[PDB]
Amino acid sequence: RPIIAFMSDLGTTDDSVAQCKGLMYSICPDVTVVDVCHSMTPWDVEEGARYIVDLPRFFPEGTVFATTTYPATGTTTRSVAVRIKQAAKGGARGQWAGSGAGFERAEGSYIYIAPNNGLLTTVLEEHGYLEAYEVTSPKVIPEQPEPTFYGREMVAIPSAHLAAGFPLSEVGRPLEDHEIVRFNRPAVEQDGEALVGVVSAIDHPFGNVWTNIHRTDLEKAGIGYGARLRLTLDGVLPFEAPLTPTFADAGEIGNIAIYLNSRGYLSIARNAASLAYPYHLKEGMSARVEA
Amino acid sequence: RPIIAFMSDLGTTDDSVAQCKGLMYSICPDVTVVDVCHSMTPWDVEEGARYIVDLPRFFPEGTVFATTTYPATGTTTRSVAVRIKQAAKGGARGQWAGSGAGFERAEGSYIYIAPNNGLLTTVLEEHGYLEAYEVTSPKVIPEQPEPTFYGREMVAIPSAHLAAGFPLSEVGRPLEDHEIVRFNRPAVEQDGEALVGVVSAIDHPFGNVWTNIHRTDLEKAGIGYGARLRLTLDGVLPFEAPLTPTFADAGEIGNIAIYLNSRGYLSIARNAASLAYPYHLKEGMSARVEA
Amino acid sequence: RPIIAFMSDLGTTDDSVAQCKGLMYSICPDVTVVDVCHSMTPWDVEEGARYIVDLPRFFPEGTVFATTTYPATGTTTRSVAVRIKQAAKGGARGQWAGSGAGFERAEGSYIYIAPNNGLLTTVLEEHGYLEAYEVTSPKVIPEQPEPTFYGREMVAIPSAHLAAGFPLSEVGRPLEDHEIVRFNRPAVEQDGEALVGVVSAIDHPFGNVWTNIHRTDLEKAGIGYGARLRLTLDGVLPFEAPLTPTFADAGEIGNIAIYLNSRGYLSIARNAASLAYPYHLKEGMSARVEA
Amino acid sequence: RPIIAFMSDLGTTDDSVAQCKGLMYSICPDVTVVDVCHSMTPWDVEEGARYIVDLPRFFPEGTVFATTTYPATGTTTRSVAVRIKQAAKGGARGQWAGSGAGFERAEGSYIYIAPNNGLLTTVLEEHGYLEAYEVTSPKVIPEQPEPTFYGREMVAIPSAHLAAGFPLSEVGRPLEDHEIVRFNRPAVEQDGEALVGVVSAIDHPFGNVWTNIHRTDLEKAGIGYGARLRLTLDGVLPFEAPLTPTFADAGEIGNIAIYLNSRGYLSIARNAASLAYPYHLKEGMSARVEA
Amino acid sequence: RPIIAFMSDLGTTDDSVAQCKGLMYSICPDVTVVDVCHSMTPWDVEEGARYIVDLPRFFPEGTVFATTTYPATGTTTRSVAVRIKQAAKGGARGQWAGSGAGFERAEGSYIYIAPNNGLLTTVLEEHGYLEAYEVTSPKVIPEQPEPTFYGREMVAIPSAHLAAGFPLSEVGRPLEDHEIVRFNRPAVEQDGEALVGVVSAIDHPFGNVWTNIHRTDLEKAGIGYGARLRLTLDGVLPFEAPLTPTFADAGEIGNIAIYLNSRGYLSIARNAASLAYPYHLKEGMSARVEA
Amino acid sequence: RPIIAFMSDLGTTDDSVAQCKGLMYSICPDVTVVDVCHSMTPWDVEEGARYIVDLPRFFPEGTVFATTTYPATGTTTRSVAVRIKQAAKGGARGQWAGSGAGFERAEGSYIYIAPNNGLLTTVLEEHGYLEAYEVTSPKVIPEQPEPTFYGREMVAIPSAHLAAGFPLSEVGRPLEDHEIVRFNRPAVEQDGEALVGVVSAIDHPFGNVWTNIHRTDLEKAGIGYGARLRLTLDGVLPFEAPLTPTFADAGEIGNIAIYLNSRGYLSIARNAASLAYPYHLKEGMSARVEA
Ligand SMILES: Nc1ncnc2c1ncn2[C@@H]1O[C@H](CSCC[C@H](N)C(=O)O)[C@@H](O)[C@H]1O
Ligand SMILES: Nc1ncnc2c1ncn2[C@@H]1O[C@H](CSCC[C@H](N)C(=O)O)[C@@H](O)[C@H]1O
Ligand SMILES: Nc1ncnc2c1ncn2[C@@H]1O[C@H](CSCC[C@H](N)C(=O)O)[C@@H](O)[C@H]1O
Ligand SMILES: Nc1ncnc2c1ncn2[C@@H]1O[C@H](CSCC[C@H](N)C(=O)O)[C@@H](O)[C@H]1O
Ligand SMILES: Nc1ncnc2c1ncn2[C@@H]1O[C@H](CSCC[C@H](N)C(=O)O)[C@@H](O)[C@H]1O
Ligand SMILES: Nc1ncnc2c1ncn2[C@@H]1O[C@H](CSCC[C@H](N)C(=O)O)[C@@H](O)[C@H]1O
Ligand SMILES: [Cl-]
Ligand SMILES: [Cl-]
Ligand SMILES: [Cl-]
Ligand SMILES: [Cl-]
Ligand SMILES: [Cl-]
Ligand SMILES: [Cl-]
């Protein structure tokens, strides 16, 4: 019945993740552990945030997201555990996921547990929350935690207790909003009639280029499907294509497609060929779009 | 009880596969999702085929194979769902898998669902099929599918409905045989008394070299275990060894072994050393064998 | 209820692991298969040992560890199956895992099954064993095993029978202690007042450097937290820092931390930066430590 | 007084070039040997052509160009020695080289000696010739030439005899025009109003991109300095800039400059930054230019 | 008789340097052109400066140094031509070069010609100068210079006229000191009793590490040969060795040597092994030394 | 008239070689300095030897070879200066170099000067010598030599004095034969009727493979041009071809050629393609040949 969806910076080249899973099954025998991914750049909370923010609408209600990169491991820091508000629609269009008209998710139906280091910034921003607690109770964490392995001690373990029905409000004291650490998200800037952002990610394993320019930013400027766009990357690359729903709309294999990715963001690719890999395009390069 | 075995080109560097799994558990609460792999070269249907064709005899009857690389995502194309006929023996010798005499599998016991883009070419060729349907019903796919994520929309989602016991014949109309896209498989050619093929794969993580020269191709030349072979790769690097059951039969560590791999194909390796990696041997290089 | 924790050298780039899993579910329908890792350097039994030795205390009692690199596959060799004695405490300090005071594990609670090639060397050394058997019974292995895939035939399959409650003592004859293959572990030497060992692993994905110098080796040399250490790597590159519990104790980002890792061994890192990657530090480099 | 300007595919990692030089000084004691370069891709006659075609106007009259890549070494092939007609103006503008108004060179003032394999194709095309001879006389080549080192035997040695005043007409028989091997040069095509060519070279060590679109091809298309151009590379990567004389005209460091190189061809660069290296741009990529 | 020593950023993979040499021989037939090197990082004036500052004492009086990296090519900028004052002693000890007691060089005996872009900063600092002129006369430069090739037009050509005895004072107007562009050289800082500098260069092809901490800096602190030093690179590498004259003084092959290089600067190496290459040490890393 | 041929481990990435040249022109104004190469692996005397042993027959009588890799720089070691006996024929066939019947060189006509560290081992072995002296006289070396630059101090400088006619016997005391350091050359072994040696070099820039199996080794096995050979590299990659004079005799581009290189040694290549580079073949790999 209960699900823990687990996202960490632990990698998959040793037994580290398996140690966390052993403890999850120990504490909540009937649990199903779903790997989110374990491949994020260590300590890059903005990147980790990207792998967890879009999750809730896909999962059954009552799912617990155990999400961690813990560079402050072994310090007096304690994890935060939050019940989110809106499961939140998503995608290029903003919809429920699933067959038919999709699976509508109730509010207050998902818990995230993470270091209190900004990792949940965009989860809180995009979903809101109903309650948040500091994770301190020796009922849900070790009395003597391993200094270097707080993702296990302070996330995996308590997540399993939560999955098992340990009451959220009993993990430790309520946290005020200002006590929840946030990172600052770079805003999309208007520059004349151009929108100015960045490449937010290279979409592996395809080598598509994702930007932080959202559907809603495009709406502000009236850019809908069909608009001929100039999208300039790294300052010197004035790509030109219409905004289309998908890759194949570019026609011939190799042709430039400018589209909305499954996360709702303006993106650029080649049709059934890699854009980013041959030219070594990178996250953090500038991205400007104009009609 | 139900199992979905999931093979995609999504990778494991973000939450993409986790989103599919979330929907799979949502639709079919009792399901077990088994990762086949998510590492294939995007949009290489021939390679994808290799990862799925050998699967049925290993899995419990009733298993659904959700298999996808979807470069035509967001177009009017629709997936194909097929009930295969013969589970099919396999391996170096052609046998059932498992302990004792192996686990014999009843016919008609497995469903594959895939883009209709040739991905199932070798599944159909080696297993046959009993029935095939176009996947169109809004009961099993989204009414408004995400343009760029058809592996989720048109494979993961309906696969979970099938695992959940949604009648196969209700997914959409029956497809005639000519409506199922196939790729052309390069044939092994006889060239005097040499068999001429190709390196089909580098067997990672070992760096063994796999060819498309099947056991049946060797029997047809009368080549059995013990035959001294000259196996020439890339037209220029030749090798000489007896055909042996396994690596250790080569003797000293590092010695050349020519063998039949666990999928029934002529292969070449060094004994407990890598052959491919030091010499940068690659898929697609010619492979010629002669007694 | 039953759990198989699976560690192999099979990788995750083809369907090899999924084939084993299919058979595991076939044999033991209610089993949960947990991936330990599949990324070990092929045939490196010392490295594989490291990924399995610390597992038992994390898992529910009754867990079966299926652990394999099988370079002698297809030969007359047979696997060994052992019931270990002590679950064994671990970590920087030596404790039970889990919330509160941790979860104590009963003796005799875990089975390992592996090639008899030394892979279990440190498992047996650190946990002891109560019983050990050669795996030969056609009830738990194939009568005609695939020559190249003994990890599946002789580890995965029988592990699933064991998980299903097949009596351990029925897998084949008892093995005497001398019949269980061991590798020799390089000892830490005292050299004057310095301890001399090796880099045992680069801790991915962080680039931390792990040595084979154990807490107890430090204890014997009169070294505890707070001791200023000089640690020399590769007989060239020197570092100096106090022994501290964790990374952040080093102060500024990028500063050297010398610490005890979660496995109980002397290690060195940069605080929230990679030590090993910029300097290309490697497994097998010498490591010398002095107060 | 006498000069040999030496261009080979011999490299500079062994004594090969020094062996040729030793013989040059032996034969013509007062000679000055000038290295052109020795780094060309072996056997690439088109690339070797580029390193020699622009030389004559820079050198004193009477200079001998010894130019060689000799993949047909050790065969019945013999070198060609030609006296060119026009020294030929060059550069972005088409002028004589040197201080003041430049140094005009008399017609018939330079000899090239090379394998008869097409290496001199553009030399003959851009300079014309007055006379051409097969190099066969044992007075200027070895009676027993080294099979693998014809660049030394059939170019370096005879070039030194020529520099020493050995009569050109005495090296062997006159060659007719059809007996002089030519490669085919890919033409620049007009495609609507766009010029379509290729990247002819990456200009090391800067990473500037050179095309085969000549000043005169631009002239015919109505394009002069100041014209805003769109230049597309590899059919994917677009750049836009005015045609300017030099790099600094682009303004800020890193800005795109589109210009005429010192050989007279349309080129593109970043101002005091590398264009080609970060994007891995390559020789042979398509290059399309439009006003 | 006359010598031009030529240092540029032109590389040795095309005919660019040979074009400059052709013109040098054209203008000054009896000249000897000596390659300094052509491998510097383009536009890195600090690096170019390093390859030219130590030259004068090695060369016959009357030598002309033609030294160029010209990113401002094709602009209104003009080269500077300077007669230096002190030829200047050098080396670990500060001496004349040559056999016996060395070759004492007269003052005012060397000319450098370069872009006026800071390239001569350390030449002027270490040698002083007696006169400096802007290079503008059409007698020594082209009336219509190639826009992209000012190293040839504005350095190679005029250098050859100077070698031929064209009067220095006739190249153009005298320049005031403030009109000669300088870069700022990073000072060695005292930090307690440590000297703090940088790695100024990796010494290829050996991989020795050179710092900007000079013999004279070492004298200020009393550090002479025999002093046990701690030299910390990149902030975290506290190397320890005595200051010794040479590599072999470190004893065993591979041992750390801290020494004075042939340019007079504090350096660190391994004895007959590479220090920098295995650990990827780099120019610009911090370098701290203390007794 | 005088020539110095200069082979060092100094590289061409800084002004090091230029400093030596400056001193050479200072000491011997009329000299011509010919670069042999400066690219050898530092401190690899065996490799250095390869670049110098074949030189004499190519150069005018009276030529001085200044040859250095000086890992013992700054120690009490002193260079050796030798007058060699036989200039020595060479090549695939063993002949004089040059046009016509070649240039016969008188005995005693060449001097080498080198560190006394084995660098001249093969020079002495293949040419013999008439006289050898330790280089100690302050007339030909510095009274206070630079500790780290002995190739300049103890080779370049005295070589220029010798070129200038300083009497060889006046450089210091005569050395007895046992005082001249030699390295041990690995012998070609006979192994049944196979000849067993080593890959001595990858022939750059082509990627041909050179062995230490000499023509004389082949004659001793009766192997002449036309013999079908099996040549096995690295113990595992074998090749089959007739021994032919040159590359083109292999026929089609890419075909394997086995030949005698221009230095008289058994070699293997592809015809106008690289053999070594795609397969990463390396110096030091075993090389076995059999008829
Ligand atoms: N160098 C470093 N500096 C700061 N935090 C680090 C670190 N290396 C790892 N961490 C943190 O420590 C945790 C993993 S250490 C635990 C896993 C490890 N493979 C083991 O077996 O012990 C993660 O939360 C990670 O972000
Ligand atoms: N450039 C491209 N051209 C054609 N198909 C592409 C493509 N890039 C991805 N795809 C297809 O689109 C699907 C993945 S898009 C979904 C995964 C992505 N990481 C995300 O989060 O949105 C796969 O079926 C893939 O084969
Ligand atoms: N070159 C080699 N020498 C010795 N053993 C090898 C080997 N390559 C693989 N093996 C062993 O054979 C087993 C894996 S072969 C089975 C997996 C393979 N990808 C397949 O589908 O056939 C492993 O136990 C491995 O260690
Ligand atoms: N693999 C190959 N196929 C065809 N020609 C080749 C070749 N390798 C080298 N050559 C040709 O042979 C000549 C050089 S071989 C002479 C130089 C060599 N380093 C030596 O010392 O022997 C060149 O003209 C080159 O183009
Ligand atoms: N991208 C760039 N931006 C600014 N200056 C550049 C540049 N590329 C080269 N240069 C400058 O231009 C000069 C070389 S261009 C001349 C050589 C070139 N290989 C040719 O044949 O035309 C040098 O002075 C160099 O520093
Ligand atoms: N780490 C090291 N150990 C032993 N010898 C070394 C060495 N590094 C350089 N050498 C030797 O020292 C000489 C070069 S030092 C002189 C060149 C240097 N680029 C400079 O400008 O000072 C060569 O003889 C070389 O072989
Ligand atoms: Cl963690
Ligand atoms: Cl998909
Ligand atoms: Cl296996
Ligand atoms: Cl040649
Ligand atoms: Cl220039
Ligand atoms: Cl030297």
> CA geometry: angle at A65 spanning A64 and A66, to 5°?
110
What gap in Å lies between CA A56 and CA A65, rounded to an integer?
Answer: 9
Q: What is the Cβ-side half-sphere exposure of residue D271, based on CA atoms within 13 angstroms? A: 21
What DSSP string runs through E132-192? EEE---TTTSBSS--TT-HHIIIIIHHHHHHHTT--GGGSSPBPPGGGS--PPPPPPEEET
**CA Rg value for chain C:** 20
Mutate to test the interface with A, among D208, D228, D232, D236 (most CBs of A within 10 A): D236
Cα separations (Å) of F257 from B231, F226, F247, F249? Answer: 19, 12, 6, 7
Specify the pairing of strand D64-68 against strand D3-8: parallel
What gap in Å lies between CA E282 and CA F87, rounded to an integer?
Answer: 45
DSSP conformational letter for E268: E
Domain boundary among E151, E185, E219: E185
**Does the CB atom of residue F203 touch ligand 4 within 6 A?**
yes
> Which D positions 226-285 lie with beta carbon below 8 A of chain A?
234-240, 254-256, 270, 278-281
Q: E167 with E42, same domain?
A: yes
CB A67 within 8 Å of CB A113 = yes
What gap in Å lies between CA A210 and CA A212, rounded to an integer?
Answer: 7
Domain boundary among D185, D203, D226: D185
Q: Distance from E207 to chain C by nearest Cα, in Å?
A: 14
Q: Which helix (H) or strand (E) holds B272?
A: none
Q: How was this structure determined?
A: X-ray
CA dihedral D152, D112, D116, E19 (to 10 degrees): 80
Longest dimension (CA), chain C: 61
CB D220 within 8 Å of CB D233 = no
**Does the CB atom of residue A208 touch ligand 2 within 6 A?**
yes
- The residues pairing with F286 across neighbouring beta strands, listed in sequence order, are F198
What's the 3-state SS for chain D? CCEEEEEECCCCCCCHHHHHHHHHHHHCCCCEEEEEECCCCCCCHHHHHHCCCCCHHHCCCCCEEEEECCCCCCCCCCCEEEEECCCCCECCCCECCCCECCCCCCCCCCEEEECCCCCCHHHHHHHCEEEEEECCCCCCCECCCCCCCHHHHHHHHHHHHHHCCCCHHHCCCECCHHHCCCCCCCCCEEECCEEEEEEEEEECCCCEEEEEEEHHHHHHCCCCCCCEEEEEECCCEEEEEEEECCHHHHCCCCCEEEEECCCCEEEEEECCECCHHHHCCCCCCEEEEEC
**Does the CB atom of residue E247 touch ligand 6 within 6 A?**
yes
Q: E159 with E267, same domain?
A: no
Q: Which helix (H) or strand (E) holds E217?
A: helix E215-220
Q: Which helix (H) or strand (E) holds C245?
A: none
Cα separations (Å) of A232 from A225, A286, B91? Answer: 18, 8, 52
Task: Answer whether A13 touches C (CB < 8 Å).
Answer: yes
DSSP conformational letter for A49: H
Q: Which helix (H) or strand (E) holds A141?
A: none
Q: C115 with C147, same domain?
A: yes
What gap in Å lies between CA A67 and CA A65, rounded to an integer?
Answer: 6
Q: Distance from F29 to chain E by nearest Cα, in Å?
A: 8
Using DSSP's 3-state secondary structure scheme, residue B139 falls into: coil
Is there an interface between F and D (3+ Cβ pairs < 8 A)? yes
> B283: CA distance to ligand 3 center in Å?
18
Whether cis (ω within 30° of 0) applies to the bond prior to F205 is: yes
Q: B46 with B126, same domain?
A: yes
Q: What is the Cβ-side half-sphere exposure of residue D187, based on CA atoms within 13 angstroms? A: 3
What gap in Å lies between CA C80 and CA F160, rounded to an integer?
Answer: 74
> Which E positions 148-207 lie with beta carbon below 8 A of chain F?
203-206
CB D227 within 8 Å of CB D291 = yes
Q: What is the Cβ-side half-sphere exposure of residue D56, based on CA atoms within 13 angstroms? A: 28
Position of tokens 């990473």? D207
**Does the CB atom of residue E244 touch ligand 6 within 6 A?**
no
Q: D165 with D277, same domain?
A: no
SS3 content of chain E, % helix, strand, coil (to 5): 20, 30, 50
What CATH number is attached to the domain comprising B140?
Answer: 3.40.50.10790
What gap in Å lies between CA F130 and CA E222, rounded to an integer?
Answer: 51
For residue C40, give the nearest of C7, C4, C5, C15 by alpha carbon: C7
Task: Answer whether C19 touches B (CB < 8 Å).
Answer: yes
Conformation bin of residue C124: beta by default, left when phi > 0, alpha when psi is -120 to 50: alpha
> CA geometry: angle at E17 spanning E13 and E21, to 5°?
145
CA dihedral A254, A258, A260, A265 (to 10 degrees): 110
Q: F102 with F144, same domain?
A: yes
CA dihedral B274, B275, B279, B285 (to 10 degrees): -130
Specify the pairing of strand F286-290 against strand D208-214: unpaired
For residue B5, give the nearest of B68, B79, B64 by alpha carbon: B64
Give me the phi and psi of C169, to 5 degrees please: -70, -10
What gap in Å lies between CA F224 and CA F230, rounded to an integer?
Answer: 14
Q: E34 with E145, same domain?
A: yes
CB C248 within 8 Å of CB C256 = no
CB A3 within 8 Å of CB A65 = no
Cβ neighbors of D34 (< 8 A, separation 6 or more) are: D3, D4, D5, D6, E18, E21, E22, E25
Q: How many CB atoms lie within 10 A of CB F238?
A: 18
Nearest atom of ligand 4 to the alpha carbon of D43: 26
Domain boundary among F165, F185, F205: F185
Task: Answer whether D18 touches F (CB < 8 Å).
Answer: yes
Q: D102 with D134, same domain?
A: yes
Q: What is the Cβ-side half-sphere exposure of residue F94, based on CA atoms within 13 angstroms? A: 7
Asked whether the beta carbons of residue C238 and residue E238 sit closer than 8 angstroms, the reply is: yes
Using DSSP's 3-state secondary structure scheme, residue B43 falls into: coil
Q: B162 with B203, same domain?
A: no
For the record, the structure tokens of E28 come out as 């000054």
Q: D55 with D176, same domain?
A: yes
Nearest atom of ligand 4 to the alpha carbon of D152: 16
What gap in Å lies between CA F180 and CA E140, rounded to an integer?
Answer: 54
Cα separations (Å) of B113 from B64, B78, B134? Answer: 8, 11, 10
DSSP conformational letter for A17: H
Nearest to B13 among A55, A204, A247 (CB): A204
Whether cis (ω within 30° of 0) applies to the bond prior to A205 is: yes
Q: CA torsion sign, A50 to A53 to A54 to A59?
A: positive
For the record, the structure tokens of D189 come out as 């095509």
CB E240 within 8 Å of CB E228 = yes
Q: E145 with E253, same domain?
A: no
Longest dimension (CA), chain D: 61
Nearest atom of ligand 2 to the alpha carbon of B70: 24
Position of tokens 């002190």? E86
Whether cis (ω within 30° of 0) applies to the bond prior to C42 is: no
**Does the CB atom of residue B42 touch ligand 2 within 6 A?**
yes
Using DSSP's 3-state secondary structure scheme, residue B105 falls into: coil
> D161: CA distance to ligand 10 center in Å?
17
CB B40 within 8 Å of CB B11 = no
Q: Distance from C110 to chain E by nearest Cα, in Å?
A: 43
Q: Distance from D193 to chain A by nearest Cα, in Å?
A: 18
- Resolution of the determined structure in angstroms stands at 2.2
DSSP conformational letter for E273: B
Range of the domain at A86: 1-185
Q: F265 with F151, same domain?
A: no
> F45: CA distance to ligand 6 center in Å?
14
What CATH number is attached to the domain comprising E225?
Answer: 2.40.30.90
Cβ neighbors of C201 (< 8 A, separation 6 or more) are: A14, C47, C50, C210, C283
Number of domains in chain A: 2
